[PDB]
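Re: export button greyed out
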Amino acid sequence: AIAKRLEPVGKVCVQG
Amino acid sequence: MTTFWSLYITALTVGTLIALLWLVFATRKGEAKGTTEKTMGHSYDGIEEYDNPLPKWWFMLYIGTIVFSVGYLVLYPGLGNWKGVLPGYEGGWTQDKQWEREMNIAQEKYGPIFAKYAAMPIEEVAKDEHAMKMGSRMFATYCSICHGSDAKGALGFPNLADNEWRWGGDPQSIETTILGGRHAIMAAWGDILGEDGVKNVAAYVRTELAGLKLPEGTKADVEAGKQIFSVNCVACHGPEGKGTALVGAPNLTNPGAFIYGSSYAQLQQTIRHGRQGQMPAQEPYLGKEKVHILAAYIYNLSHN
Amino acid sequence: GYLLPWGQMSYWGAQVIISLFGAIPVVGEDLAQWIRGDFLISGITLNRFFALHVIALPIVLLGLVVLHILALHEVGSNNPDGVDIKKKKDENGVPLDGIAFHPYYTVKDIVGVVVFLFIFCTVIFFFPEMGGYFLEKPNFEMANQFKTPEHIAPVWYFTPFYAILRAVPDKLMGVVAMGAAIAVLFVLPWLDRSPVRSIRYKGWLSKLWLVIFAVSFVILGYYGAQAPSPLGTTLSRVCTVLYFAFFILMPFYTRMEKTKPVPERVTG
Amino acid sequence: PAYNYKVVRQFAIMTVVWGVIGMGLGVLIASQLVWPQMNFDLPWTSFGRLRPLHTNLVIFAFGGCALFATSYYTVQRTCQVRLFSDTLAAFTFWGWQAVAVILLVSLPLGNTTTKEYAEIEFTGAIWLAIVWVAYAVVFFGTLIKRKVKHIYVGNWFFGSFILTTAMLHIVNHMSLPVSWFKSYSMYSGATDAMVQWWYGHNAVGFFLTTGFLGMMYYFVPKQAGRPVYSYRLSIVHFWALITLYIWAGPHHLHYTALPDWAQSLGMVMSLILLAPSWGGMINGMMTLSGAWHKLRDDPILRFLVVSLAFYGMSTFEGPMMAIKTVNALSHYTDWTIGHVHAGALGWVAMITIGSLYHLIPKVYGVEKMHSVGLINAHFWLATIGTVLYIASLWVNGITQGLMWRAVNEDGTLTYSFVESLVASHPGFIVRLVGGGFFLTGMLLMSYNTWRTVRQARPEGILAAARMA
Amino acid sequence: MKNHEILEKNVGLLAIFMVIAVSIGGLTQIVPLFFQDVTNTPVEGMKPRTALELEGRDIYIREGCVGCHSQMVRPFRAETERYGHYSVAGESVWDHPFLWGSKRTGPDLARVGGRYSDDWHRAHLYNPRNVVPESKMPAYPWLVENKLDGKDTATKMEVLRKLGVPYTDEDIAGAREAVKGKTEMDALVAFLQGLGTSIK
Amino acid sequence: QLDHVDIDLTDKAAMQDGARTFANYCMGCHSAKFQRYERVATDLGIPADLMMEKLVFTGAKIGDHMDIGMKPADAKTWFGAAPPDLTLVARVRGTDWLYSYLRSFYEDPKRPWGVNNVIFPNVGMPNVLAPLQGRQVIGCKQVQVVEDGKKQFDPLTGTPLTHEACDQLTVVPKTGELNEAQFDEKVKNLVTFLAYSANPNKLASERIGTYVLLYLAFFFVFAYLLKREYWK
Amino acid sequence: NDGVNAGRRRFLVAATSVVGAAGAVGAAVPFVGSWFPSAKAKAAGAPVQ
Ligand SMILES: COC1=C(OC)C(=O)C(C/C=C(\C)CC/C=C(\C)CC/C=C(\C)CC/C=C(\C)CC/C=C(\C)CC/C=C(\C)CC/C=C(/C)CC/C=C(\C)CC/C=C(\C)CCC=C(C)C)=C(C)C1=O
Ligand code: HEC
Ligand code: HEC
Ligand code: HEC
Ligand code: HEC
Ligand code: HEM
Ligand code: HEM
Ligand code: HEM
Ligand SMILES: [Ca+2]
Ligand SMILES: [Ca+2]
Ligand SMILES: [Cu+2]
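Workaround output, generated via the alternate export path:
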């Protein structure tokens, strides 16, 4: 619950 | 109630009554019969107390209310789970049982009248003065906090005296509305139509449709209003804005059927935030027979 | 001390207060620079004021409090009635209206201390800022030598004198008037020519002027805590006049008035 | 040696002050019921919020202060001893004023428990118990340090009142706190109703009848200067009254969801309780045997006698409304309010007025009230204004009961509820006028007390206390 | 008959006798209401009021509507016809405090649940005279403005659970979200609509 | 004119969302250097590992201050004004000012960063929450009608009765991730976290002060008795 | 002064002294507690290779 609340805004799409 | 609590609610009460009898009999044990001017001696601040006896009428009232107390407490419930020996009720006076007998006697006497008028069609009852006064009172009680005390309504509630009917006006519709309840829907055309379009077509209902004049000094586009009307406004309304009676769509050409106002400050609200009016389904709270005469009082308040 | 936090209010109030020393006609700028220890308010001024605030002035204050209490105990306390209780003494030499400070006034002061601590702890634990007056909001921003607050004001307990300084259009005369506002209280004992001590037995003029002085002091503090305003400036000037007149006219209106006879024994 | 008259005179002054405020607020809420626009659409002056303040100030601030004054005064004089402790005696005054101020500051803000006469919330109901245990200590220790061999009947009434309105206070306020001044009762539904009304019927009967019966027992024979009518009648009245006022509680839930055995017990116990109350009234009235002619000269004695008469009226009405057949007509009608104000304006307010008009020129050293003519005027204003209130509310409540219960021969209801409201509106205006009359009488007493309080020199106050 | 004099000479004996006499009545009418099934068994089909319903009941308590309205329909034919099925004990088992009332300045509210639309309660609770010209009900044009913050919703639910109301951790968690952005008028109206819904 | 915001410092979820918003959208330019990640995690109820993984982007330790790489002088050169440290900004400006300021950015081509602020005119801060709020402009929109404080709501629906006004902050539709209410909640959580950061001792202060005041009332009772007695 | 009530005076003095001593301990709590290792001190250290 806290982890979802604290998710960083920037999402990076990575190879594999 | 367990037998412990029954015996508790019996023993404590009977002990309180017997002790209250002992109190009134011991205190009167050695009364000086005749009224006395002699003081009791002890003076506290000058307040000396006489030794006059217990007045007879007060003593008789005391022991007469302590025999009516083994009265209502032997006929009616109260001495624990003890039921009662009052002739009649099978189980002593119980609020529920008194109510049941009251309603049973009221279904034999008041009840048969409700069925005669329930068998006629809603218009034959309608021209029966007695059913009309029954309506009058039942509408006054159950049906005036919305539709007004005069069947004309207020802001948001239809005038079922005026001859325009949004949900239909035939006798059946004036019974299905009153029985099944009606939840009319006006979709919120605020953003779906544009914040300015809700103020252009709004000046197409108040204008040509309603036959009024835009508040002097206001601005709109009647042409764009109509081009909106004919596209996203005419489906469940009328093509001339005169209502589809089976969706509850009112007459947009008559500013007397409007239950949500007619000004070009109140017509936008209808066209911006939506309006979803509800007719309380009056079957459960009233029944099927009291609600079939309330279906006739509205057919002789407006239709006749 | 207010400079020590090194907030915006700290820095800029110190800057203005020390620039006041630049108003002295001849040695003003040199004196201000010498006080600052730098060409502006800086960490040198901070460390210097910290040393003064943490040791030197605490020592001076403790010594002055010792001298104050010693002088009082030499001459004895006044009282609300202004009655010289020492005049009337019993066979043991104890004044008739006198009671031993310990234990009676020690317990009274204990009660007063508990009440004060109740208020003090309420402020500490619930309203430490006190609406921004005990801890000013702009002082929670770090000192910025290059951006000054939109409106810089003193701590509330310096606001009255500030108003006086702000009431004088001239800078040097404003500084002089602010200094005299405090210096006149020194000569107060010689300004009062009343035959009685307590305001309870002074004439109507003394009561009126004490009311005027208290109101003027409060108004000066209230209007020195805000940015200048037309009504604020007018009332600040009027209250400066009244504040100085309370002292300047004291030697006169303490004589013109008619005083009540002081009772031989304290009332109560 | 003397009496601690400081606390009694503080209580009397605050009794006048609190009665004026409470009755003015009652008039304000009555006007609101007449004209809704008197709410001014403000949250803190609406009828729903202010009415609890009225009913908790008149009972606890006016009546409570009056009973404190007449207990701290009667107990000492009848015991010939100073109050137990001046410390706790003054604390019971300042803390009671704090309780009144809490009622003023909280109930308008909406911090209420919904319990008719336990509206003061958590941390406000805990201080009212802290200051009530101190009151019990002050009274019973004084009764312990007596200098006389017996204890007077009024002392018995006051002590029973004090103990019962501590047991009731702790029991009815047994709740759980959500915050300061926010609470939830530990009882639910029928249990909560039974506890609430077992407390509320003792907020009267004990706070308004037993304690005031002691005030009567002292001030009636004292004012009339005649001995009490009967010692045995006093004993029976006291004992039966205290043993039946607890029992008679369930008559406030006569036809509700409460189990029917409890309702029957309550009605029967109230019908029994009729007798001891009338015994007390008989004692009070017949204490005046041979002294009725003093009613033409002394308006204070008129106050006391009319208070006793209204007490008899109320204690006859109440048992009648305890009958379920009668209670069916009048359970939610204005007749309940009419009975309340018959027992409050007629009985509690009048006995209070008579007792303070006697006490105040004894704790201040002044021999007489500033204006006896003002006393007579206040008596007439209170009588015409309690009678008006009683009659208007009787008519109103009977009208509402009949209209709600009225049924046409068809079985349909004859009238709607709005019809009952409009029919009651004339009763509302007449009630407002009667309340205005009583408030004018209260204002007259406040002026008389202000003019009697001033002109009372330091020594005159001091000599009056001198113990005897 | 002179034995009474003993209680006069001893404060302790008189105090004990008074305590016992006042306790006898109380211990017979309140204690047995506990452990009695009729006054403690909820009517089948009822559930604890939702978080918003609880907040609405709290507002109903705050505005002191108990002094005017009653939530106890007596078992009288006129009463039940006017208001509906008479109230029963099981309906109030989770009501801390009970709001039956003792005065009817307005109609009984024991069965208003579902009788009238939400759009009536609004426009009647904002200005009662707008829809009932003769109404003496005070206007409440402030429940619309102020909005519930949900500060005490969790604590209120937990305390009510401690008092026996069958709440669940899901309700405690979700109360704050349920009362996040809803005005006090919405909460009061929702509480009103839930009244007497268990019995029809 | 500021907008009031009811900030619940006991709301751990709201403070957590505000901390996330601050760490992502604000710590790019603003430091919270008077505040440690460890204390923020302890007070917000965030596990230390979770705080490390989710809110510490600068490689600092848990016990380190919330410092950022952007130096005040560099940022002053770049923006025209140094982004102040935001640990105490809630105390410096107040929560209402922050709530109104973070929602008052509107497009202004005349300005260096294309935006201005109603609360802070000519502010040097770029509108960094534009992606969330969306494009906000000074235009015409519906505002509740008010006449000398006579505020009109809809009696039936309970919604405001509105008239058009052409000097109002309006968000261009479908330009931001969050609607008005969602952005309001985002800004509320951010300002709640800033309020906590400015005064992290508030809740403990209230508790300790309650106990202190209870003790002082007790001590006052005893001292008052010892005074009034002994003064007889 | 007429017949000072000793014991009551002694009890009040003792009770006030004890309560004041408790308050003194409480007021000392901030000063003694501030001397324990602060958050600056508790930074700890990581293993060194
Ligand atoms: C907006 O803005 C504004 C506000 O703000 C926001 C305001 O608030 C205000 C309002 C302001 C107020 C009302 C606030 C007022 C506040 C103040 C008054 C603050 C003022 C404080 C200062 C600026 C500090 C100034 C300090 C000064 C000038 C004093 C300096 C003193 C020294 C440096 C001391 C010198 C040291 C000495 C003498 C050394 C010791 C000497 C020795 C010889 C030691 C002994 C040595 C020996 C013994 C050896 C020699 C031996 C001997 C003698 C031989 C014989 C031996 C023997 C011993 C006998 C305004 C107007 C304002 O607009
Ligand atoms: C007595 C209990 C009632 C009778 C008989 C009727 N009603 Fe109503 N009413 C209400 C609304 C909001 C509507 C319109 C719904 C909509 O489309 O938004 C109505 C409408 C009717 C109609 C027909 C209307 C028409 O013009 O054709 C009839 C015949 C009718 N109602 C009968 C509102 C309310 C209300 C508020 C809660 C109550 C208590 C009642 N109405 C009661 C009655
Ligand atoms: C808390 C703020 C309250 C709520 C919620 C309601 N009331 Fe009342 N009430 C009062 C009167 C004199 C009436 C007459 C009829 C009318 O005004 O429409 C009413 C009516 C209602 C109703 C309608 C009930 C029905 O069966 O139609 C509801 C739902 C209602 N009220 C809700 C009087 C009073 C009152 C006396 C001053 C107060 C304090 C309240 N009402 C409080 C509330
Ligand atoms: C979360 C998105 C952020 C919040 C909340 C705040 N900031 Fe900034 N900011 C930036 C600059 C260059 C300035 C100075 C502008 C000037 O002085 O004219 C600011 C200023 C603020 C302020 C004003 C504080 C005051 O005391 O006046 C507040 C309250 C504030 N900021 C809050 C720059 C930036 C920036 C660089 C792109 C970012 C990412 C943020 N700000 C983020 C936030
Ligand atoms: C069906 C989906 C509809 C569409 C599309 C439009 N209207 Fe409507 N309208 C509809 C209903 C069911 C109602 C009554 C709802 C109720 O609660 O009573 C209405 C009502 C109106 C009114 C009059 C309001 C009143 O008090 O009676 C107006 C002026 C109105 N609607 C305007 C309007 C316009 C301009 C529309 C197209 C742009 C439009 N409506 C569409 C049903 C439906
Ligand atoms: C700032 C620290 C100060 C301390 C600790 C202090 C201490 C005391 C104490 C304990 C007393 C005796 C009790 C009392 O009268 O209240 C006293 C008396 C007095 N103080 Fe203060 N004082 C201080 C500041 C001042 C100031 C700033 C003034 C005036 C400018 C002042 C003027 C007086 C006078 C005149 C008296 C005796 C008056 C009387 O007997 O009524 N003191 N001081
Ligand atoms: C033997 C004496 C009395 C009896 C048996 C009695 C009985 C009753 C009854 C039957 C009710 C109706 C309550 C209801 O229907 O809800 C009632 C209400 C009330 N009466 Fe009495 N009464 C008596 C004396 C008094 C006195 C002397 C007073 C005031 C001094 C008083 C004040 C009240 C109050 C406060 C209520 C509660 C009002 C309410 O329920 O809201 N009563 N009483
Ligand atoms: C001018 C004098 C007074 C006026 C105008 C007045 C007015 C009112 C009004 C309007 C109500 C509520 C009416 C209703 O809800 O239908 C009420 C209730 C009440 N009043 Fe007063 N009052 C006065 C004096 C008193 C006094 C002196 C007492 C007690 C000492 C008292 C005790 C009560 C009680 C206990 C209730 C609650 C009745 C109930 O809940 O059924 N009143 N009063
Ligand atoms: Ca009630
Ligand atoms: Ca009531
Ligand atoms: Cu009763």
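Residues F 25-26, 28-30, 75, 79, 81, 83-84, 86, 89, 92-93, 98, 101-102, 123-126, 128-129, 190 surround heme C (ligand 4) (CB under 6 Å). The button fix ships in the next patch.
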